[PDB]
Amino acid sequence: LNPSLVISLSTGLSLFLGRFVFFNFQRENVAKQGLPEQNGVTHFEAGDTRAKEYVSLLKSNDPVGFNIVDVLAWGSIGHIVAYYILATSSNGYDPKF
Amino acid sequence: MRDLKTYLSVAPVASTLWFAALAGLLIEINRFFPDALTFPFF
Amino acid sequence: DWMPGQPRPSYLDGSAPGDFGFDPLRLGEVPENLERFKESELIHCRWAMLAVPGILVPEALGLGNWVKAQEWAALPGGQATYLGNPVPWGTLPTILVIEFLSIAFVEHQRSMEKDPEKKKYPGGAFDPLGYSKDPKKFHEYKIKEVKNGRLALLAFVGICVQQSAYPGTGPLENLATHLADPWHNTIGNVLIP
Amino acid sequence: DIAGLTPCKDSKQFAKREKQSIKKLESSLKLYAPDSAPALAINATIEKTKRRFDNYGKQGLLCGADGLPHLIVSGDQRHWGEFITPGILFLYIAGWIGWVGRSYLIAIRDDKKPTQKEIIIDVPLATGLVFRGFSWPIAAYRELLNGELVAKDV
Amino acid sequence: KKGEWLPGLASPGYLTGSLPGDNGFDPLGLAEDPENLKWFVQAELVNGRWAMLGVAGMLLPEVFTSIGIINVPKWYDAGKEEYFASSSTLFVIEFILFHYVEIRRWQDIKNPGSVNQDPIFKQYSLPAGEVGYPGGIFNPLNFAPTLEAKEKEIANGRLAMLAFLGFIIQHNVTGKGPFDNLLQHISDPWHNTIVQTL
Numbered sequence: 001l002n003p004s005l006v007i008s009l010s011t012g013l014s015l016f017l018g019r020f021v022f023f024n025f026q027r028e029n030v031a032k033q034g035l036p037e038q039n040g041v042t043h044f045e046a047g048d049t050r051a052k053e054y055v056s057l058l059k060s061n062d063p064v065g066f067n068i069v070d071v072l073a074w075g076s077i078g079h080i081v082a083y084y085i086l087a088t089s090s091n092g093y094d095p096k097f
Numbered sequence: 098m099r100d101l102k103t104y105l106s107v108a109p110v111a112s113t114l115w116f117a118a119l120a121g122l123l124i125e126i127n128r129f130f131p132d133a134l135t136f137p138f139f
Numbered sequence: 140d141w142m143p144g145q146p147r148p149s150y151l152d153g154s155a156p157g158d159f160g161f162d163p164l165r166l167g168e169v170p171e172n173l174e175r176f177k178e179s180e181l182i183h184c185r186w187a188m189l190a191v192p193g194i195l196v197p198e199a200l201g202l203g204n205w206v207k208a209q210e211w212a213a214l215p216g217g218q219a220t221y222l223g224n225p226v227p228w229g230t231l232p233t234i235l236v237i238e239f240l241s242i243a244f245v246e247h248q249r250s251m252e253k254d255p256e257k258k259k260y261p262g263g264a265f266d267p268l269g270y271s272k273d274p275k276k277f278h279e280y281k282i283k284e285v286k287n288g289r290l291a292l293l294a295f296v297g298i299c300v301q302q303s304a305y306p307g308t309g310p311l312e313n314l315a316t317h318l319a320d321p322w323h324n325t326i327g328n329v330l331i332p
Numbered sequence: 333d334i335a336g337l338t339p340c341k342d343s344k345q346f347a348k349r350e351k352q353s354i355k356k357l358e359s360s361l362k363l364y365a366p367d368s369a370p371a372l373a374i375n376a377t378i379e380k381t382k383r384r385f386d387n388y389g390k391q392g393l394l395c396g397a398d399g400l401p402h403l404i405v406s407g408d409q410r411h412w413g414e415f416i417t418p419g420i421l422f423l424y425i426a427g428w429i430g431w432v433g434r435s436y437l438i439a440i441r442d443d444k445k446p447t448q449k450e451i452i453i454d455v456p457l458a459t460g461l462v463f464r465g466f467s468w469p470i471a472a473y474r475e476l477l478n479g480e481l482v483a484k485d486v
Numbered sequence: 487k488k489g490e491w492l493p494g495l496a497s498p499g500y501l502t503g504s505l506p507g508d509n510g511f512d513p514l515g516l517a518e519d520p521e522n523l524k525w526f527v528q529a530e531l532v533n534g535r536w537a538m539l540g541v542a543g544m545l546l547p548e549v550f551t552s553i554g555i556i557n558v559p560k561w562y563d564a565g566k567e568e569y570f571a572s573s574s575t576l577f578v579i580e581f582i583l584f585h586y587v588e589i590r591r592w593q594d595i596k597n598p599g600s601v602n603q604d605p606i607f608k609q610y611s612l613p614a615g616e617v618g619y620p621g622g623i624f625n626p627l628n629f630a631p632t633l634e635a636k637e638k639e640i641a642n643g644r645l646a647m648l649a650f651l652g653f654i655i656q657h658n659v660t661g662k663g664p665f666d667n668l669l670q671h672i673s674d675p676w677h678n679t680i681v682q683t684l
């Protein structure tokens with residue numbers, strides 16, 4: 001009901017899940033999938049300057065590598081689910097058994 | 098006789114005789130049970 | 140052998156616990172698929188075995204059937220009831236989030252393993268009584284586990300299909316109505332209305 | 333009833349169409365002599381029409397708002413006589429034809445000049461072969477199971 | 487002399503008289519393949535045995551009730567008479583039992599000898615007989631399975647199958663049991679035949 005409470009709780013919980021539960025799984029999957037490549041070379045290696053990975057802002061001081069991009073991602077997931085909860089709880093819709 | 102049989106079994110002649118017989122059979126079946134739109138026996 | 144007189148698949152010898160050569164569709168042809176299949180089978184068997192008593196025991200008591208006990212959630216004021224008393228945190232969004240989080244964490248922790256024998260039979264913290272000491276007695280326990288698990292899976296299938304056949308009834312109710320008049324009240328009326 | 337249609341026996345537009353058809357046929361009859369060959373032919377046609385409509389009502393066909401019979405082919409057991417048992421009959425006859433022709437082709441495939449027996453049909457062999465189509469449903473089934481219906485190596 | 491179904495016609499080569507009842511009758515050539523012949527012999531055995539049992543069941547009760555000993559209904563209408571159990575219950579029980587026994591028979595047919603053993607009591611196995619002819623417990627009186635008796639079985643089964651076909655067609659066209667038809671024909675054979683029936 002209280003939008004701030006629900007949003008903050010859900011976002012913090014999603015960040016906790018990303019940081020402590022699914023962290024290693026996601027890192028392993030992104031490692032094994034790798035960068036997108038064309039004709040065997042990555043997009044940057046083919047001459048696409050803008051395809052270069054932004055190595056600057058991706059690095060972090062977190063012990064395990066939790067950086068900016070994944071805080072954005074997990075917080076976005078948390079907010080999406082939080083607003084789904086809020087809208088659906090205040091919608092007043094009721095199915096009939 | 099033998100050559101008459103041979104020519105009488107050549108594709109066109111055999112086909113025309115077969116189709117004449119089939120047409121006659123179907124015509125008689127329709128005549129006995131005309132205007133049949135379903136199979137009512139079972 | 141699952142079928143006296145039918146030749147057995149080559150990749151199923153009979154050494155695995157519960158191997159009876161049943162694989163008509165030959166799904167376990169590839170060994171790396173067969174290992175995952177074995178783990179999945181044990182997980183399903185364990186869930187069904189831990190569930191079926193859960194479907195039956197509360198029904199035997201003065202509570203509703205397995206489908207009525209999970210109908211309170213469809214109401215605007217849904218609130219759960221355990222052993223005849225209303226639980227406090229019974230409202231749906233709670234139960235839902237707590238269950239999702241606990242199950243996700245436990246399942247991920249389970250999947251973070253690559254033995255792959257402890258993948259199916261982990262042990263340690265999950266074997267307090269320590270029944271896995273004698274390697275051959277452990278094998279017969281494995282056989283009994285898989286057999287009872289398959290039986291429980293079949294029982295759960297029967298429960299669900301009965302529920303579909305007669306909506307709003309429970310397995311014990313079906314058993315009681317069968318015992319009331321065996322011959323007339325059977326599956327036949329369902330098969331041939 | 334099914335698809336909002338009504339039985340032809342109790343339908344009204346069906347009866348109206350029946351009456352109109354008979355009226356149209358009778359209109360021509362009154363012109364000729366009462367007992368001439370054209371009059372007899374027209375009377376026979378009228379009787380045929382009456383019998384047809386009575387039979388359609390009898391078999392229990394469904395009639396739409398147009399007043400014409402409609403065929404249900406969904407599989408309803410009340411209408412298997414409309415498409416399913418005629419369908420089975422057609423499948424039997426067509427498989428008879430195809431199996432007999434295939435048997436002939438396979439039989440004549442071993443000669444040095446098979447084409448000669450194709451433009452000039454070897455009737456003696458054909459008369460023996462045509463009767464295999466009585467039991468082709470079994471011959472084809474065992475042909476498939478035995479694995480030689482379909483040409484391997486292709 | 488293997489028995490000729492057409493004195494003037496030679497018998498097919500694939501038929502050699504080894505099988506009981508081999509009279510060389512196969513105009514359509516349905517057994518050109520040894521495997522097809524091996525399957526069809528078992529099919530004929532089982533069909534004939536079922537036909538014999540069924541025709542006996544339809545005939546004997548009818549004549550017995552006609553002469554006045556038991557009061558059973560006709561075979562065609564015997565389905566309505568209400569028994570101690572619902573019809574569907576009886577059907578499903580029969581389905582289970584037959585689904586077991588017929589699969590046992592099938593396993594015997596596919597690879598002979600693999601199902602001669604009782605699956606519950608490890609002893610009590612069937613004597614190593616031949617497909618379609620499983621002796622042992624199925625033959626308590628132990629009548630000799632001599633070849634001549636097998637031919638008699640085959641002939642009686644063929645007669646029974648013909649008789650069942652006649653039973654059903656006569657009931658469809660006339661509308662009563664076969665024995666009533668025979669009695670009516672005997673009363674006046676020259677005015678009670680298929681011609682007058684049709």
Ligand code: CLA
Binds near residue numbers: 156161166175180
């Ligand atoms: C999801 C449950 C599950 C799974 C994953 C397995 C997996 C396995 N089983 Mg098992 N089994 C099960 C349930 C299961 N079983 C049940 C319920 C029974 C009792 C009927 C058995 C009885 C059984 C025997 C007797 C044997 C096996 C064996 C095996 C292994 C080899 C067969 C194989 O590779 O196919 C893999 C199987 C699957 C991928 C599951 C198929 C799922 C498909 C897609 C859907 C099935 C449709 C189903 C009929 C729907 C019913 C619905 C209802 C309305 C009726 C394998 C590891 C053999 C073995 O060697 O054991 C080690 C063996 O002999 N099973």
Ligand SMILES: CC(/C=C/C=C(C)/C=C/[C@@]12O[C@]1(C)C[C@@H](O)CC2(C)C)=C\C=C\C=C(C)\C=C\C=C(C)\C=C\[C@@]12O[C@]1(C)C[C@@H](O)CC2(C)C
Binds near residue numbers: 513515537540648
């Ligand atoms: C199985 C069978 C009958 C079984 C009957 C049963 C169980 C009846 C049961 C009941 O009655 C009771 C007891 C009590 C009743 O109240 C109820 C019912 C339920 C009704 C008959 C088979 C009957 C089978 C028949 C008639 C088969 C005929 C086959 C023929 C003629 C084939 C001939 C040829 O095949 C050859 C041999 C060679 C080929 O090359 C050429 C051709 C010509 C094709």
Ligand SMILES: CC1=C(/C=C/C(C)=C/C=C/C(C)=C\C=C/C=C(C)/C=C/C=C(C)/C=C/C2=C(C)CCCC2(C)C)C(C)(C)CCC1
Binds near residue numbers: 011071072074
């Ligand atoms: C320092 C640190 C810490 C902490 C920290 C924090 C707490 C922070 C943060 C943060 C956060 C917490 C973040 C977040 C998030 C993010 C983002 C980036 C997001 C998002 C979302 C979105 C964007 C959405 C949108 C939408 C829309 C608009 C539409 C509709 C609705 C929705 C929702 C869908 C600690 C002490 C623990 C430890 C050490 C380190």
Ligand SMILES: CC1=C(/C=C/C(C)=C/C=CC(/C)=C/C=C/C=C(C)\C=C\C=C(C)\C=C\C2=C(C)CCCC2(C)C)C(C)(C)CCC1
Binds near residue numbers: 406426428434
């Ligand atoms: C029931 C029905 C229906 C439907 C159905 C369906 C949809 C199904 C199917 C089907 C299918 C899916 C089929 C298939 C097939 C396949 C294949 C693969 C095959 C084959 C065959 C062959 C190949 C043959 C050959 C031959 C013969 C045998 C004949 C003659 C000779 C020859 C050689 C030609 C409907 C509803 C409409 C209506 C009603 C009826």
